[PDB]
Ligand binder design. Structure first.
Ligand SMILES: Cc1cc2nc3c(=O)[nH]c(=O)nc-3n(C[C@H](O)[C@H](O)[C@H](O)COP(=O)(O)OP(=O)(O)OC[C@H]3O[C@@H](n4cnc5c(N)ncnc54)[C@H](O)[C@@H]3O)c2cc1C
Ligand SMILES: Cc1cc2nc3c(=O)[nH]c(=O)nc-3n(C[C@H](O)[C@H](O)[C@H](O)COP(=O)(O)OP(=O)(O)OC[C@H]3O[C@@H](n4cnc5c(N)ncnc54)[C@H](O)[C@@H]3O)c2cc1C
Ligand SMILES: Cc1cc2nc3c(=O)[nH]c(=O)nc-3n(C[C@H](O)[C@H](O)[C@H](O)COP(=O)(O)OP(=O)(O)OC[C@H]3O[C@@H](n4cnc5c(N)ncnc54)[C@H](O)[C@@H]3O)c2cc1C
Ligand SMILES: Cc1ncc(C[n+]2csc(CCOP(=O)(O)OP(=O)(O)O)c2C)c(N)n1
Ligand SMILES: Cc1ncc(C[n+]2csc(CCOP(=O)(O)OP(=O)(O)O)c2C)c(N)n1
Ligand SMILES: Cc1ncc(C[n+]2csc(CCOP(=O)(O)OP(=O)(O)O)c2C)c(N)n1
Ligand SMILES: [Mg+2]
Ligand SMILES: [Mg+2]
Ligand SMILES: [Mg+2]
Lengths: 586, 585, 585
């Protein structure tokens, strides 16, 4: 007939199906720790080495499974360390609960040790942000935070004065509303609007279907629409793998973490079907500047007409809408536009294969990723950090609907590779998990390699050591007038870092070393984490947003220099293929 | 070809169908003003006398029509004056766009005159809160603000450096996304959840259906479910009028702005169907402590199981779900529970009528509200302020589906009567509009009586002058150890205030004066605003949350005292009627 | 032995010497109310009619006396209504304590009625901003709030869950730290910096001393430095009256709420001594573009070199430093610069007198202010609203060191006239108090005329009724392309508003009516408030920032037009006087 409030809080977490949660203890959160300790057989605390990793891992949990991620930080600095993961959750719109320690209510507002008003710290990041002041309502406040975080797809933060969880409350009054949870209703496509949309799409001279992760349930429909109608596909970077990369009319993504065929085609398209997509570069890059008709399908009214003016907007679930389109169309014959794009994709893929297929000499990112592909299981999960790896993984990983990949899509916090892989292995112990990270990003969260060791999480860590912030060096090349600054730095030997945390590891710097090292890693990771430190060149990846290949656009000198720098002697501009099939370049 | 960015902003407002907007000019917003000035045929600027009235009116526009309300304030104090209306919009979850003036970009962050970082001011109230820094993107920012305010049912705030609207931008780049706006088509209510909910409701001995304004489209279904199944109805106060008040099994609302039958029945119910309802008193009042099964229908996942542990919570539209229940049920004969509740309602209504039907003597709020009922058109709109008037209007107004009534439901800001009535008349110039306000709340926004005059808005204003913050006086009676403080104050003659703003007006203090003054006001308000200042007694209205009528519950002395104070000699407790029909309390 | 925590809170206020505090009660603050109710002999609660007036009055208390002002608001809308006064206190850097009601701790975070997280609301305005969560520490939190508000010269806000003040706490634990309060003893002004500053000032050909209210203790030194050295004086508008306006070398203020001689001389000066001054127009107006050497004296390191590149900036007290200058200088003979400025002032004052001295015809603001001067006591206090009244009062009031005047200096919130006058009369019941307000600003806070009546505060209210936001109309004339909008509106008869709150009042519209109405008002205000509603013309006051008088600068046609519009035929540009005394412009 009494229960400690902290025990009730843990029971609320259990009712909501939380399996694991992350943080670092402190006096200010030791009463939650005490309750966790008693519940260790039913809910699983993961002690991280820096609280940002806990927050990042919580966000990654939710990205992966759709289940609210849970993290905590002790008062003051524990909680402020969560921020990069909390902002990742906000911007990637995934549910996360963050608990923040606080001084007991008898010492709050006394200016005592590490005691401050913590509520304003979290006001900007959080959907729901409260300091608890009563023990008997604390289960409700946690319940409320969870329910809001789910409903609103974002972060709920509760600051908990440490006395409250040690107070007895009536056993029979508290409850969880987990039993009542439901996911949002999937609205239906208006029949006449879909018919009009379909007519406009079919009348297009140079159509494209351009989807994001809002279409993640619709890969079959996307590929069949493409095949039936002879309409190429392109996607946001995060939507890579929804349709298998091998599909010959998959163009890739646009902008910079991009593939050449997608940029080139988008510039020529007259009609775009923009589906489940909130591409953030739309306006700033003038992506749709010459698009004649723009057709949008999205579940969120806040998105309709956001990125360009729509000619037809459908507020509906992507898969229901795409299914409705598919059900009212029949097979169309080939067109010049279709064949031009198919030929362009083959040329591009041959380029990427030529980089991958080198067998000896100085190691580049491209062969490292080929070596990843060669040991990758069909349902592998990839946690990808932030930098050139997004660009290179987007081009080289061979994904299918069976895979998952995650990064910090929009906040783009470096350091997520390690935490996302921790989360992935916890959620999918029987699936192969990679952490693909640059040296700058791996550096930021390197201590939590120890967490993979501690919890025996068999992640395959691959660090891309260029001794640079390469992504930023290339930006300075593009914009800055004075010499590079802050973008070239000393080596860190991550094989030695791994040794220090008691993780098996390898360092390689030559292409010919890859096959055996990756086989060894593949086998180690049947039981324990492993790290490969790939010492790679400073070669810049081909900039798909700065092509110098079309005689009509670029000087001979510039073309020659581009081909030489990027080993791109066999790449053709899309206009070559347009011209073969009798179309103008526009 | 170029367009001024401010002109494009006004065209974005026009594209979204904004009819009218409110504010007070200042140097820091004079470039938006300049754009408005060229567009008087197409959008109608309402100059208020205090910016809070503009914000409150913008919220009221959206409460009434479902279409975004728009207001503005000049840099610094113009914008901070919006707050009570912006918080009203946030808490009543209605879409409002607020534009805030700011110093030009060349002087921002110089600590110049009335120049501050304005963004933090609005961070808490606003769903979307940005300072614009570019002219070419300004139309998009306004469009984005509107689209989010709608999507998220709340407040969007844009701080606009005054230079930007005077800059030329390319004419053919900007657009509005109003053309994309639509409402979702939903699947069928979840068949197997609704079927199991229905069985639990029908198996109950003492069922109630307890709805809020999320059931605003479901009045017909509510009443027919009630009649067919013999299940009494109760509502949130704001949900008054969704089912006509005359319906004999409408119990009213619970808690304090409440009616006796609803409080009494809720304490007895074994099963409650909670539909379209976010009653904020649920937990603090232990409203459902006795309830065996708690069933919910709501459109918002964030609400499912929120207010009480819920046995079945259906995520669906209220009307559609109630219609799907009604399609799977059929007539039940009258039950003792049904008859007891019917009898209890009849007794309560006789009490209220006895108060209304006095013909002479010192004026009370009760007769004033009878006089409003006797001049009210069937489709009248009521803008109601905050205080005893919520309590009294909830009991006495005779509403039907044809009426609307609005107040500040959850933020409960006083002063909302005047601005809500302004908004109602602007939206519905052919409908009768009342502002029902206590003296305290009318005082707070009294200067905007001049706005009704200036714009020839024929509101019937009724001020309830008790020379008190009566609602708070009664609270102090209940809780405070020491003498009343801050709750009794000196008279203001609102007939004289009205004369000062050039509005026709009357002051009355006797019951027998009401008929001819209200007839005159009804006639004046065919063409011009009017005010009636009703000088009322300090009598405390019956506290439905503090009943002393049941001799099983309360001492004879307490009952005697209650009956005396509240003129309640003929009220019977619900237990009398339960017993009459063979039920235990 | 125990004490209620609320009683201890009131004793903390008493320990700090708080005489009076303002607010409106509500359930969410009724436990503080209960404590106040037991302490009426020792602290005086002023029930206002809108919480913004309480916040504005609290700020005004501190502006006037230097002692913390105290206000409160009920949860949600009571507290948000404080904002315009709290931002006034922040921007005018005066100490204010604001108490905000909150739901009891047992219902916080339940989404109950008018319950929200209130802490983010006040985060931007407040130096200190906390929600109390314990009764035993509540006295300390209030003490801490006060001590910080003083130390940091700004606003401290405490949100108080209503249960805490009704809890018993140990009687002998709590304390106040008022007994520790004191002011610092400072070293000598830096000797070698002051000596080098002095040489630079004296070497100038066209020096000016330009002071703000940081020189409030230095009026004697300012005037004697000016007279001895033959250096004209100019000030910020708020610094009017530190040196008597009659002083022949007082030029006035610069920019718009300005006087012609100050703008003209500043543009010519080679050396400016900027003392106790944070003039917010410095950079945006390029005030010092022509100045060769810029010298500063200020008490705040944050100000040193802030407004212009500074040759010598002395961190010191203004009075002490000006006295140390005066002790190291001696008489200089009259210079051409001195004589030119003297002549320019004489010509300007003759212009203002010509406006004041009209005896009959349509009433203008100028004669109203003459009529105020002719009933004003030598130690009168003026609470001034925001608009043309700042401009006109700055030109026409004849102040001395014995007067005080206050407005919202930097936030510039309209509506401050009424509350500032309430605060002035509460602090100084034996001193004559005026509220000088435009119709727009008086409208915003008109209901609190009833507070003057209720508390028998004999303010002389003078409303300048032009049926415009005149200050903004003139801005639109200057900047806007399209027609005036939002700046001309329908009359309010403030004599009738006054009658409605039971205040004696007059309305005048002709110059010849002024003497007998102002005499009557002077006499009424020996015992009761009074209001004069002065119906004034729409004439634009001379724009000192837009002078068209110098034929080297302006066309003959522009000069002719300026002279006609502003009745300025006899004004001469400063260059005339510079030439007369042998100086180039
Ligand atoms: C270093 C770095 C660089 C990057 N640069 C690029 C780049 O050059 N190119 C690129 O493409 N990306 C890039 N990104 C990612 C980019 O920032 C955006 O996150 C991404 O383009 C947006 O993808 P999205 O629209 O699929 O996802 P989101 O932004 O999450 O949008 C999903 C959309 O789907 C809608 N939706 C959700 N569910 C449904 C449903 N059931 N039915 C219909 N609609 C639904 C949503 O409402 C929303 O509009 C980069 C990332 C990193 C880390
Ligand atoms: C001075 C004062 C005192 C008051 N005291 C009382 C009192 O004693 N008693 C009282 O009853 N009220 C009182 N109120 C009002 C009270 O604060 C709450 O605002 C009110 O009880 C909540 O009403 P609601 O649930 O209808 O509205 P809301 O709080 O707006 O909730 C609407 C609900 O409907 C759901 N919904 C919306 N659309 C749909 C749909 N299509 N289908 C299904 N669900 C939908 C929403 O998700 C939400 O849960 C008072 C007001 C004032 C001014
Ligand atoms: C509608 C309106 C229009 C206005 N327009 C004008 C205008 O055109 N012209 C104008 O002049 N004003 C105008 N003002 C006022 C203006 O906004 C500023 O408030 C004013 O110019 C600044 O005055 P200040 O420097 O005296 O005061 P503050 O800004 O308060 O600065 C006081 C300075 O003194 C220093 N200080 C304090 N104590 C001491 C000490 N003991 N010793 C030394 N230094 C000390 C401080 O550190 C600070 O730097 C207007 C006001 C309104 C309401
Ligand atoms: C925490 C953080 N700081 C800075 C950035 C900006 N940033 C984006 S990519 C990048 C460089 C990443 O370097 P590295 O991980 O070494 O990858 P590379 O591009 O060299 O492969 C930087 C600094 C960021 N996104 N996150
Ligand atoms: C702006 C604001 N301040 C304070 C309150 C608290 N409050 C709720 S009702 C009330 C009294 C209302 O008085 P009045 O308008 O005279 O109505 P009465 O109850 O006397 O009829 C007060 C002060 C509030 N809701 N809004
Ligand atoms: C609350 C508030 N809203 C807007 C402004 C902008 N403002 C500065 S002066 C002014 C006009 C004042 O009009 P009035 O009080 O009638 O004085 P007048 O200039 O007509 O004498 C306005 C609207 C402000 N300072 N405060
Ligand atoms: Mg690197
Ligand atoms: Mg009242
Ligand atoms: Mg005016």
């Amino acid at each position: 007939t009494n229960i400690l409030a902290g025990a009730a809080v843990i029971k609320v977490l259990e009712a909501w199906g939380v399996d694991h949660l992350y943080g670092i203890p402190g006096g200010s959160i030791n009463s939650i720790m005490d309750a966790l300790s008693a519940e260790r057989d039913r809910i699983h605390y993961i002690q991280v080495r820096h609280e940002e990793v806990g927050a990042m891992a919580a966000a990654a949990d939710a990205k992966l499974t759709g289940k609210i991620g849970v993290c905590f930080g002790s008062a003051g600095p524990g909680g402020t360390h969560l921020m990069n993961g909390l902002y990742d959750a906000r911007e990637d719109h995934v549910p996360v609960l963050a608990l923040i320690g606080q001084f007991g209510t008898t010492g709050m507002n006394m200016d005592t040790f590490q005691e401050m008003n913590e509520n304003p710290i979290y006001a900007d990041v959080a959907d729901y942000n409260v300091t608890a002041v009563n023990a008997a309502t604390l289960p409700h406040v946690i319940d409320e935070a969870i329910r809001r975080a789910y409903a609103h797809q974002g972060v709920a933060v509760v600051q908990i004065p440490v006395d409250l969880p040690w107070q007895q409350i009536p056993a029979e009054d508290w409850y969880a509303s987990a039993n009542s949870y439901q996911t949002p209703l999937l609205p239906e496509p208006d029949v006449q609007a879909v018919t009009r949309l379909t007519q406009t799409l079919l009348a297009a001279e140079r159509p494209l279907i351009y989807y994001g992760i809002g279409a993640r349930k619709a890969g079959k429909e996307l590929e069949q629409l493409s095949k039936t109608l002879k309409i190429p596909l392109m996607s946001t970077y995060p939507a890579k793998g929804i349709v298998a990369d091998r599909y010959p009319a998959y163009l890739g993504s646009a902008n910079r973490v991009a593939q050449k065929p997608a940029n080139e085609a988008l510039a020529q398209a007259d009609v775009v079907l923009f589906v489940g997509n909130n591409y953030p570069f739309a306006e700033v890059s003038k992506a749709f500047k010459n698009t004649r008709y723009f057709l949008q399908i999205d579940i969120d009214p806040a998105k309709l007409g956001k990125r360009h003016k729509t000619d037809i907007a459908v507020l509906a679930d992507a898969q229901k809408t795409l299914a409705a389109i598919l059900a009212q169309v029949s097979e169309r014959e080939s067109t010049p536009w279709w064949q031009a794009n198919l030929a362009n994709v083959k040329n591009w893929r041959a380029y990427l294969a030529s980089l991958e297929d080198k067998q000896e000499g100085p190691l580049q990112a491209y062969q490292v990723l080929r070596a990843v592909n060669k040991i990758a299981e069909p349902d592998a999960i990839y946690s990808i950090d932030v930098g050139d790896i997004n660009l290179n993984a987007n081009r080289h990983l061979k994904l299918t609907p069976s895979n998952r990949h995650i990064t910090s899509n929009l906040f783009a916090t470096m350091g997520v590779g390690i935490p996302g892989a921790i989360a992935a292995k916890l959620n999918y112990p029987e699936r192969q998990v990679f952490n693909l990270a640059g040296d700058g990003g791996a550096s930021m969260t390197m201590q939590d390699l120890a967490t993979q060791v501690q919890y025996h999480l068999p992640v395959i860590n691959v660090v891309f050591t260029n001794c640079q912030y390469g992504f930023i060096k290339d930006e300075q090349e593009d914009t800055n007038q004075n010499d590079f600054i802050g973008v070239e730095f000393n080596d860190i030997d991550f094989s030695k870092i791994a040794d220090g945390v008691h993780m098996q590891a390898f360092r390689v710097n030559k292409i010919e070393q890859l096959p055996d090292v990756f086989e060894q890693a593949k086998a180690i990771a049947q039981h324990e984490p492993v790290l490969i430190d790939a010492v790679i060149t400073g070669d810049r990846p081909l900039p798909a947003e700065k092509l110098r290949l079309d005689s009509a656009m670029s000087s001979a000198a510039d073309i020659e220099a581009f081909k030489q720098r990027y080993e791109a002697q066999d790449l053709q501009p899309l206009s070559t293929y347009l011209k073969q099939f009798g179309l103008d370049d526009l």
